[model samples]
Target chain A: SILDIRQGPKEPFRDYVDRFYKTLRAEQASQEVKNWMTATLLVQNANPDCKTILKALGPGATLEEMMTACQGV
Target chain B: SILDIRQGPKEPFRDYVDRFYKTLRAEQASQEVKNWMTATLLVQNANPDCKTILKALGPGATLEEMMTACQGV
Candidate 1:
């Protein structure tokens, strides 16, 4: 389920990036779907501070972009 | 907005508690609503590790219980 493909509370942001991306790939999500999910789920789960930065990246931001923003924290 | 009331990415879990609760109170949310929102939102945005513990808390867990779970992470 999409809900289960989430970062753990103690899991590092980078670690989550890896785990989620693996699932993203395993699910064979298309670029369009992957991008959409990346932006939506990442923002949905992002720490409020990180969410601010990601949202500033605009609606079209990619998974890499979101991860970079998280890393910047 | 309910969606806007989220924890900051870089913000400590404890710090987020204060902010989210303030929003919940400011909105005059009832105990029932507060608990529901807490479980849903906290699980949605929790660090993946934290989410695991929260889900294990079953459906009746309180905001305090969720916070304690996060602290344990």
Candidate 2:
């Protein structure tokens, strides 16, 4: 089973990234968006809840913008 | 909100597929796996805390097997 990274326990950032992306792709974000989301996924990977990030990346935002924000991490 | 499927509430299978596909692709499971995962998500969509089909497709399950089994659902 893919590792679970949530409030139940704290996991490494990369591991969190892995789970975050897993959920992101499971929901079928475009490949480009998937890749873009990965770049910044680590930033929010270990937050109180990773779902918050996914909830935030709405449509109409460019991948570039997404990456730029991820760069903040 | 996209929708939530679990003990709190049960989302339609289609919505479950959407969320499942999103996570699969985000996690970088091959696009093939993401597609296959989507097919089966509906089967267990209404299960509270839904997350079984994804657990079954380990590191080496073929896409065909996934889809066929998912179709039975």
Candidate 3:
């Protein structure tokens, strides 16, 4: 069982990114929209390095733009 | 990443027993005295064959006792 969703040491960004969303989706299944806190959880639970990187990228909010950020990390 | 807690066909009973509890503890941490978040559980998530086996040793209060049913499965 995965106790924490933060990126694991020695795990590449590619694997960590997939693990991040898969676990996040499960938590979504358990929550109602009114109680949704995933976005909050995402920012709060990220590893410090990941947290910094995500902040600098800027979420200009387009899927293709998002993939650009994913590649650099 | 254990999307399903049920016993895999090729898996052993005791191994599944260990995993069931490990997953349960995560979900529990993820309950309180059993939280309102008690949305899903091993008994319910478990496949029918394993669920039936659990019915034999049956229900009990303690964590160890829960595995008694698991013992036979």
In terms of lDDT, which candidate is strongest? 1
Q: Count the clashes in each prediction.
A: 15, 25, 2
Which residue pairs collide in model 3, if any?
B28-B31, B32-B35
Candidate 2's C-alpha runs over 4 A off are: A1-8, A11-48, A59-73, B1-51
Q: Write the per-residue lDDT of candidate 2 for residues B1-73, one digit (tens) a residue.
A: 1123221245543444556556655667675544433333333333533335534654345545544434424
lDDT for model 2 comes to 0.43
- Candidate 3: where are CA atoms >4 Å away? A1-73, B1-3, B21-40, B55-60
- Error at A21, model 2, angstroms: 10
How far residue A18's Cα lies from its native spot in candidate 1, in Å, is 34
Largest TM-score belongs to which candidate?
Answer: 1
- Candidate DockQ values, in order, are 0.06, 0.09, 0.02
lDDT of 1 by residue, B1-73 (tens): 4455555655667777777778768868666556545655656655556666777885667777777777846
lDDT of 1 by residue, A1-73 (tens): 3445556655667877777668768867566555445656656655566667777886667666777777746
- lDDT at position B73, candidate 2: 42
Q: Give lDDT per model, in order.
A: 0.64, 0.43, 0.46
Q: State residue A9's C-alpha deviation in candidate 2, in Å.
A: 3.5
Model 3: per-residue Cα lDDT over A1-73, one tens digit each: 1224556544444566567567647655454421222222333334566545544654333323433554544
Residue A32, model 2: lDDT of 64
Most accurate candidate by DockQ: 2
